[PDB]
Amino acid sequence: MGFEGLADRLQQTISKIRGKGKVSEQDVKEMMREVRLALLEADVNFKVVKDFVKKVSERAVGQDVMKSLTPGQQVIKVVQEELTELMGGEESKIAVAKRPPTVIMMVGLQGAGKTTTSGKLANLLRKKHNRKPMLVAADIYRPAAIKQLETLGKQLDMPVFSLGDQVSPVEIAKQAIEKAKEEHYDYVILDTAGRLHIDHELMDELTNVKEIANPEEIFLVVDSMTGQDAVNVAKSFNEQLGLTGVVLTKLDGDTRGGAALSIRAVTNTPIKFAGLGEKLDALEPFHPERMASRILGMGD
Ligand SMILES: Nc1nc2c(ncn2[C@@H]2O[C@H](COP(=O)(O)OP(=O)(O)O)[C@@H](OP(=O)(O)OP(=O)(O)O)[C@H]2O)c(=O)[nH]1
Ligand SMILES: [Mg+2]
Numbered sequence: 001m002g003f004e005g006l007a008d009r010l011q012q013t014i015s016k017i018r019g020k021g022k023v024s025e026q027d028v029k030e031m032m033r034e035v036r037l038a039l040l041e042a043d044v045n046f047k048v049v050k051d052f053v054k055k056v057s058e059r060a061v062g063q064d065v066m067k068s069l070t071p072g073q074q075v076i077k078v079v080q081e082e083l084t085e086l087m088g089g090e091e092s093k094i095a096v097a098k099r100p101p102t103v104i105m106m107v108g109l110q111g112a113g114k115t116t117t118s119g120k121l122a123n124l125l126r127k128k129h130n131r132k133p134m135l136v137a138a139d140i141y142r143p144a145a146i147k148q149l150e151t152l153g154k155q156l157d158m159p160v161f162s163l164g165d166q167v168s169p170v171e172i173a174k175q176a177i178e179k180a181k182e183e184h185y186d187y188v189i190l191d192t193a194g195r196l197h198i199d200h201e202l203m204d205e206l207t208n209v210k211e212i213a214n215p216e217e218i219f220l221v222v223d224s225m226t227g228q229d230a231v232n233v234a235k236s237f238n239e240q241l242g243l244t245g246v247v248l249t250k251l252d253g254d255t256r257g258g259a260a261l262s263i264r265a266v267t268n269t270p271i272k273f274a275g276l277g278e279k280l281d282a283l284e285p286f287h288p289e290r291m292a293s294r295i296l297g298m299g300d
Contacts (some may be wrong), residue, residue: 043258
């Protein structure tokens with residue numbers, strides 16, 4: 001899934017280049033004003049679009065136009081290459097701690113998909129990597145937040161560590177990680193708290209949890225359909241504590257892809273996984289070249 005609208009807007013511009021055997025410099029400029037326009041309408045950060053247009057234009061008006069064995073193929077290769085680089089190049093794999101367990105801290109705003117993604121990530125870790133993960137209920141403030149995560153764990157046959165809602169998340173994380181050491185769990189996934197907007201009470205708690213958990217990974221969970229808002233959430237989260245990755249949720253509803261194309265360029269935090277639905281299997285690793293190909297109508 002993902003990017004359906006941007007691909008539709010770019011189909012004519014790109015295909016016109018693909019269908020010709022000689023690309024003039026006026027053709028590349030004409031393609032580039034329409035590519036610029038499509039990226040801006042897809043809510044890509046406008047400074048990212050500016051840098052992207054210049055980088056592609058400088059390379060496109062080069063050896064590619066003058067060599068005519070496949071001039072059109074070369075204009076498209078550069079766009080694919082630059083789209084791939086923009087989104088991170090190669091897939092960004094989950095880190096493995098030197099001493100187990102590997103502790104993964106899930107953070108984000110309410111409604112972004114934290115709790116659901118924590119279950120998805122555990123499921124993915126056991127299936128694709130044959131690890132033994134433990135889930136942790138560290139969101140005490142919202143009722144049914146614990147029972148929701150427990151209900152997910154009861155579908156995965158995976159433990160969900162909880163001490164109720166009368167106990168600090170700092171203490172819950174401390175006990176969970178130290179139980180995980182004793183019983184040889186590979187991964188610990190902390191489902192943390194969060195309201196609708198960032199506040200001081202939230203970073204203080206998250207800073208304290210990071211302090212005692214000393215996590216190998218801190219993943220922001222953020223809603224892909226919120227566009228530039230998601231890019232701003234990542235910037236704040238990355239500067240007030242340290243983000244190591246991003247999970248983009250609800251691409252099954254994101255036709256534009258602005259956040260997907262903007263987050264790494266603005267924050268330097270890589271996007272590691274994409275959420276693609278409500279079910280626990282709906283999580284795939286973020287592959288930048290495949291996304292670039294899906295953007296150019298080159299999908300498998
Ligand atoms: N389609 C889709 N949906 C996702 C994905 N990830 C999460 N969701 C939805 O987002 C909503 C919030 O998920 P939570 O896991 O409760 O998020 P939170 O902990 O950050 O609050 C849930 O819907 P809800 O609370 O039942 O309803 P609503 O909030 O959507 O109205 C869930 O179904 C995804 O990858 N694709
Ligand atoms: Mg939640």
